[PDB]
Amino acid sequence: PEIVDTCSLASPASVCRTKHLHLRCSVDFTRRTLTGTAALTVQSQEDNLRSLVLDTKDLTIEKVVINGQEVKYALGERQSYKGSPMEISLPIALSKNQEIVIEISFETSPKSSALQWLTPEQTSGKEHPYLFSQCQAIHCRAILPCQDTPSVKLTYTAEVSVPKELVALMSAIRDGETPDPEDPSRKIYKFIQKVPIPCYLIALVVGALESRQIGPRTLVWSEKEQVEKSAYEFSETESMLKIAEDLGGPYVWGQYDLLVLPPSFPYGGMENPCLTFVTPTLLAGDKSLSNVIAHEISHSWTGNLVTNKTWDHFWLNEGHTVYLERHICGRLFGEKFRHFNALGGWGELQNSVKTFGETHPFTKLVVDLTDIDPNVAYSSVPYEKGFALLFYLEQLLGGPEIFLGFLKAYVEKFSYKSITTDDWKDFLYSYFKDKVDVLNQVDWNAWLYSPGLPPIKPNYDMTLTNACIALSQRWITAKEDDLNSFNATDLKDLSSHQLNEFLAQTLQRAPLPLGHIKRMQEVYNFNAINNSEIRFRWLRLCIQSKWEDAIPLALKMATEQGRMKFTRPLFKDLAAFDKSHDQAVRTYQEHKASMHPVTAMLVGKDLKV
């Protein structure tokens, strides 16, 4: 059979396909285990199928029941980050399109790489523990046995038993709660996901959660400490959904709830279906980062509805998502803003080629992950080189309204399916068969398969970047006597996004002399800004410029939140600053127990404790 996905040890989708999962599990915070049964409805694609293989990782299997009889099964040799294949001897010979239900009784490991168990000290409310999953890319196999590959899409239902003081949520539509009949100290929460999904988008959260309704199909969920702030910050979600529907086609998932995770959450968002995960660092107070969730909204079309068939083709997901997200922001803020974000994205791509190196295989759009861990691979280039490709093609093929027609047609063509880069390109050529000679001028080999920067740079409107570059070069080339010219008026027509870009460019040339920084504070009062993107770049700029006063602000930020994008570079700069280095040690020691364990660990391994 054709091997679709080399990150999966399971029977390929050419051999058999999981159509449905019914999960019945119990969450035990004392043992940090999920225990229960996974009933998989599987469809044979072959005749004479007598055994099938599933992915597992650090699972304990108690038994496998098919039609009411325990059946033989064997776990094979672990293949490092891929885990161990689970071969199931079927009690029947399956023929093409025949179905069987396989009920696996399982328990997760407390060290499961998919499950993030938080102590009460690692939550906002400090009293209850908290659990959240992160299956992307190939961690679902560490929750339950499955064909752990985006080449297979399945529906699911679930029943989750939790301690009765807590609340479960999943990447699904809420389907009621009841007392656990087997244990009055517990509650069972029920879920249904009627749209087929790849298993990396199976998600679970258990915690002391409260909700506010902020739209006809949106509740925001969080611990009680964050939920009011969150209900305000994201109050425009429904209007972003409508814009996304206009750009990409109808929203097919029913509900679009939001979950704002605890401050210790070290990542950015996650597009779990029907329940986007959100970092609390987006809680700026003025909604200036509220548009950042347009990224996860966009995945509801590009990634969750049309899905990459393997992790080699992940750029299809991210790239189109960023393309759609920047159109949402263009609808909101104008086409000049879309070019502004697009240009800044080009800059981020430059940085990453330079960080990885213009030869590094992680600067390719299509990557061969055969012997590469995809849980590291999908983290990068797929975002901005993929976006650049689509933006270059947009400009080649007659502009945004015409290329948005392609986007909607592509969503319609491949809804509920999984595809490769060649499927995408074949459809591009088919949709634009009238412009094939134009498409034949594209250096596909360079764009899709070669590392480094793309062969051609798109045309970007420079309106908004210009005002930033002007003001940043003034400072960067200004002497001490010139400092009196700067003043508040320099910022009059600058958005928060422009403020951020200005700091991005000033930090690129870091450090600035102490007097400049002191003066910049005096006239622009960047110490006052609560926007985490702005504050992060400002405090990096201060520490890198050796200002004494920024040391406590940078420590506070680096520990008030766990986002690794912020916490790690801040701890790096504070340790690199010989003055703050010691205080940065004693701060990481005093706080690491409130931190996400991976964030205390990597910040330990950076600070060398």
- Please state the residue numbers annotated as binding site for Zn(2+): 295, 299, 318
How does DSSP assign 233-297, residue by residue?
Answer: HTTTHHHHHHHHHHHH----SS--EEEE--TT--S--B--TTEEEE-GGG--SSSTTGGGGHHHH
The torsion angles phi and psi of 327, rounded to 5 degrees, stand at: -70, -35
At 473, list the tokens: 């070069």
Q: Which of 107, 159, 296, 394 is catalytic?
A: 296
Known binding-site positions: 134-136, 266-271, 295, 299, 318, 563-565
Q: What b/e readout covers 385-419, taking b as 16+ CB neighbours within 10 angstroms?
A: bbbbbbbbbbebbeebeebbebbeebbeebbeebb
Quote the Cα angle for 150-154-159, to 5°.
Answer: 120
Residue 351: strand, helix, or coil: helix
**How many residues belong to the chain?**
609
Q: Is 574 exposed, middle or buried (0-12, 13-18, 19+ CB in 10 A)?
A: buried
Distance CA 342, CA 127 (A): 44
Tokens standing for residue 468: 């930033």
Q: Side by side, which strands form the sheet with 130-133?
A: 115-118, 130-133, 204-207, 167-170
- The identity of residue 471, as a single letter, is L
**CA within 13 Å, CB half, 336:** 9
CA separation, residue 497 to residues 77, 83, 493, 494 (Å): 51, 43, 11, 8
The region that residue 142 occupies, defined by phi over 0 for left and psi between -120 and 50 for alpha, beta otherwise, is alpha
How far, in Å, CA of 175 to CA of 149, rounded?
Answer: 27
The answer to whether 521 touches 487, Cβ cutoff 8 Å, is no
Q: Is 121 a catalytic residue?
A: no
Residue 23 pairs with which residues in a beta bridge? 38, 158
Enclosing H/E stretch for 84: strand 84-94
H, E, C per residue of 378-422: CCCCCCHHHHHHHHHHHHHCCCHHHHHHHHHHHHHHHCCEEECHH
Rg (CA), the chain: 25
Kindly report the number of other CB atoms within 10 A of residue 458's CB atom: 19
List of E strands, 145-236 = 153-163, 167-170, 173-179, 186-198, 204-207, 210-215, 218-222
Q: Are 159 and 175 in contact (CB under 8 A)?
A: no
Reply yes or no: is the peptide bond before residue 137 cis, omega within 30 of 0.
yes
Instruction: Return the C-alpha torsion angle 64, 68, 71, 74, nearest 10.
Output: -10
- Give CA angle at 232 (228, 235), nearest 5°: 130
383 is catalytic: yes
Among 130, 383, 392, 524, the one annotated catalytic: 383
Q: Tell me which residues are annotated as active site.
A: 296, 383
